[model samples]
Target: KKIFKPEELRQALMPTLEALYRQDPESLPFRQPVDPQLLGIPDYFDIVKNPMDLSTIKRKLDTGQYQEPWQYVDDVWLMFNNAWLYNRKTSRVYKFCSKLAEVFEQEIDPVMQSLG
Candidate 1:
């Protein structure tokens, strides 16, 4: 569950999550805007700005203190990446970090795998 590459993350954040993460941009409901006042910084990731790397994003969410109303697993994945990209850093990885940690600890020949 390594985090997707930065470019992949950027690509995935289409229309700010229009394709997934419960994106509903085209619905008939009246759409409102990116009011900075309405949308304050998210403290969940605990970063003042979005992170430049998946590692940092992962740790931010891993703090487990992020108080956002995370709806699902995909939500976590999307949010972390979305936040990072959208923030001053962009817009934003809990599972990504956890999976990678497991892989690193369980690999029988991490060095060899690294070389491969």
Candidate 2:
């Protein structure tokens, strides 16, 4: 997890950026389902809810059932977004949001625009 090559984070970023794109710009990360046990183990559960049927994509990489990078990234996007919603304290990272900040409007958008 600590070793990514040049621009690899870009590929990983797509799943998250893509998922958020389908959702309303405001209610993001998305209001997905979560485990009830989170009430007790919010800290621990927030880290990994694979037992609660939350992290399917990561399950593959965890079990050496690696799929495409996008799939792994997509799973991660879901996992954390669920956690962010489950806990009222967490906030979405603004850097990745297409709706917020100037970098996305000025820089990142151009990158995505040029990619297509």
Candidate 3:
């Protein structure tokens, strides 16, 4: 059941996501879905069951796949978590994921608390 209108969700969530996108140093890898063939990681899907990316999240948000604000939060977390799971801790992407995760929490926590 949807408690809020899609517009309400968009207004609340879009700014936070935009901030995250801007924070990404223009990294386009996460702007779209990952390509296992390009990366030559044939088992990427095997390791990352829930493949997520900024574009996918945006699409879901625009399409109203998220009924709750926390659902949107979870998907963002899953996006970061997927990167962490697939990339080595010493890798650049892993560091970027950490930074984005921190920023996301800082921006979204207050909104979540306010909703509560």
Candidate 4:
């Protein structure tokens, strides 16, 4: 299991993701909402507004302890990429994140069956 530093991953991923957005606008999943409060940041959004908060993010990375709902955020990102790569569909990041909630259900089904 390769552990990635959050900052490092953010640095590497943001540009690629931005390029993906630029190269194919149709594939973009998020738009900056006019209401800043409603504009939720993606799980991987670099929290650069306050560098002091970097330590908090890094601690999560180190301990593998993502905040509550964000624990599985990567799966959402993976699905978003998959959709972009395959479906040629676009959605908001929040929507994509919400849809990713299903990924856990899919993953646990087989285990539930076995336990039953």
Candidate 5:
């Protein structure tokens, strides 16, 4: 009953990502893959084994890796969760991840329910 055509899913997902990208400041860190080397955190990968980011998600969508709507949603969550895992609760990046995740939930909830 909740079946989604690939293009339909893509249509619904892209704007959600666009909304995230427009968030500025907070969205900057999440726009691309995290570079542990540049950040000087060599243990980042050890802590966040499965990293996710907005650009990577977009690329995966373009390549049709999201066979289901939840896959897209899951990756978004994973990105935020990874940030939370690697940063202290009081850190700016953690706050950014928290706000961005909320924004994502707001953007996606209606679409997901509509599809259902």
Candidate 6:
């Protein structure tokens, strides 16, 4: 029923996520307030600019104190985890797995098609 692949879904959502990072408060389709603490980097709109690295991310998580050096790694992790689930009890590592099978049918078998 759907035309897009799982990878396509990830791509679509990623841009919206980046928009959220860039202070586009209204860009997200999902209904939730953008947490102010998440938007620390001034040039978040620029994709080329890497935010804080993993070490910095972990430090922020440990401290629970948000500031510079503490980037949006947690938000990234949360989005990734949510995208991996199918039903609440079932585990599917890719979004729209079946749709991905349809798109990548030529290159991949059904089982391998959904991998990120």
Q: List the residue pairs that clash in candidate 5.
A: none
| Most TM-score-accurate candidate | 5
| Predicted candidate 6 versus true structure: per-residue lDDT over 45-73, tens digit per residue | 34322233223333433454432211232
Highest lDDT: give the candidate number: 5
lDDT of 1 by residue, 4-114 (tens): 344433332322323222223321111222234455645534542332333333443444423332222344344344433444432012333333333433432332243
Q: What would the per-residue lDDT of candidate 4 be over residues 1-116, giving only the tens digit for each residue?
A: 44445554444333333333342333234323122345453433343221212223334445545433233335334444434443324545434434443444454345334323
Question: What value does the lDDT take at residue 38 in candidate 2?
Answer: 53
Model 6, which residues run further than 4 Å from truth? 1-65, 69-71, 86-116
Candidate 3 residues lying further than 4 Å off, grouped into runs, are none
Q: State the weakest 10-residue window (summed lDDT) of model 5.
A: 1-10
**Shift of residue 55 alpha carbon in model 2, Å:** 8.3
TM-score for each of the candidates: 0.20, 0.30, 0.91, 0.27, 0.94, 0.22
Per-residue lDDT tens digits for candidate 3, residues 3-99, read 7778788888988888788875634567889999998999999999989999988998899898899899999999998999999999888888888
Per-residue lDDT for 22-110 in model 2, tens only?
Answer: 44553243234344465455565545455322234324434554334444444544554544445454345332232322222343444
Clashing pairs in 6: none
Range of the 10 consecutive residues with the lowest summed lDDT in candidate 1: 25-34
Give model 3's TM-score versus the native structure: 0.91
Off by more than 4 A, model 5 = 1-3
lDDT of 5 by residue, 17-38 (tens): 9989999798999988999899
Better of 1 and 3 by lDDT: 3
Give candidate 5's error at residue 7 in angstroms.
1.3
The candidate with the higher TM-score, 4 or 5, is: 5
Distance from true location, Cα of 93 in model 5, Å: 0.7
Worst 10 residues of 2 by lDDT: 95-104
Q: Which of the two candidates, 5 or 6, achieves a greater lDDT against the reference?
A: 5
User: How far in Å is the alpha carbon of 74 misplaced in model 3?
Assistant: 0.6
